[PDB]
Amino acid sequence: DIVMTQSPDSLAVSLGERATINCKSSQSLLLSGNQENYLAWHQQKPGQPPKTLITWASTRISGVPDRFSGSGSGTDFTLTISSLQAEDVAVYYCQQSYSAPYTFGGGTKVEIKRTVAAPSVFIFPPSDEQLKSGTASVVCLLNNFYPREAKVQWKVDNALQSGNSQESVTEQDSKDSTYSLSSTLTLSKADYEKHKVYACEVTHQGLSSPVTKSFNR
Amino acid sequence: EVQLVQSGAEVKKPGASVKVSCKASGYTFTTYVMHWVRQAPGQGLEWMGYINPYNDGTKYNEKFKGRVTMTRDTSISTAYMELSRLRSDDTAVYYCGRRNFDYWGQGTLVTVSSASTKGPSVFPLAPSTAALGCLVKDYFPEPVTVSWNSGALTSGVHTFPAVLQSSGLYSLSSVVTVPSSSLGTQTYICNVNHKPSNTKVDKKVEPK
């Protein structure tokens, strides 16, 4: 199978600035019989269907704005956005149409670039109503931060937790361009009541040293 | 305008099968093949195969050679895709695409689960500028929508993508940041809607 490798995986770009997404194929996509490149670029927004922008490596789909263009040949292709608009925030895929399976790249997330913003960190004990029910959900909230990279580490009586939490992150906010993150530590009642200090430790480059938030059962 | 219009969303249990349709207008159906492409949640796109309506020929990805069948009906310009023996990691949005992937269908979400329709439990994320919210736990299937004060409180609200926990049930959180001085007097109520179970929950979140 042909392998499609994109670069970078995520691209921060200021509004109005040029965006460049690169796509490399493990195999030439240029058919020598008709001298055509079999490469498409697709745009996809969160929870939205793909939308084709480019085919034949450089032919713009009818109705795609001029600021999009495709270029390159053989194994190296580029999607260019000459002046990024708010509506251009999305994931972008290249996909070869040369040989089956018609494989896609891993996608390149394109986001609005902004100044660094440290998260606000909040921790939430489980409610008694859920607790007495048999389960303890401890929630840590990371509010309005940039960039997206934010490490959360749960500590229970200062012992690192592994394998018992799940995380979720919002889409980049339309007004201030930040992200928020929710993480949930789940324990049984029985395990929850065996310990005292429940802590959420957050690492983020908006923070010089990690911030821990906590509570005692 | 070219249009690829797919059938609606399905929920299937493991072992079952699902047949999805894609009706094409705006061009001559037999002129171009029709591909099927799927996308598991939070992952990339993956080609499954195509059918050439002109000669009824098919080409499958060696990943579903023994599970997928494609068909077509020329007289109504519709291509079908059938995935059998549904397993849990077949959960995805399935898309049909025409020709050289130049036009796409709107997608058909297929959820493969042993779970049954179950409304959510809602729990407060109590405060002690301050943050408060609601934990919307143990429901199926998606989606849940959340509002605050019947849609009168929208500034500072983040409603997070649901997460699928080990039980096959979903869980999400909805938070909002508010003036710390308002916690004495202003009442905050999250309005959780779960259409599949015809349930709506309102939870009042207070200082403990």
Partner: peptide, 9 residues
């Protein structure tokens, strides 16, 4: 119109 690389023969 050979719109896939391996479509024609």
């Amino acid at each position: 119109d050979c719109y896939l690389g391996d479509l024609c023969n």
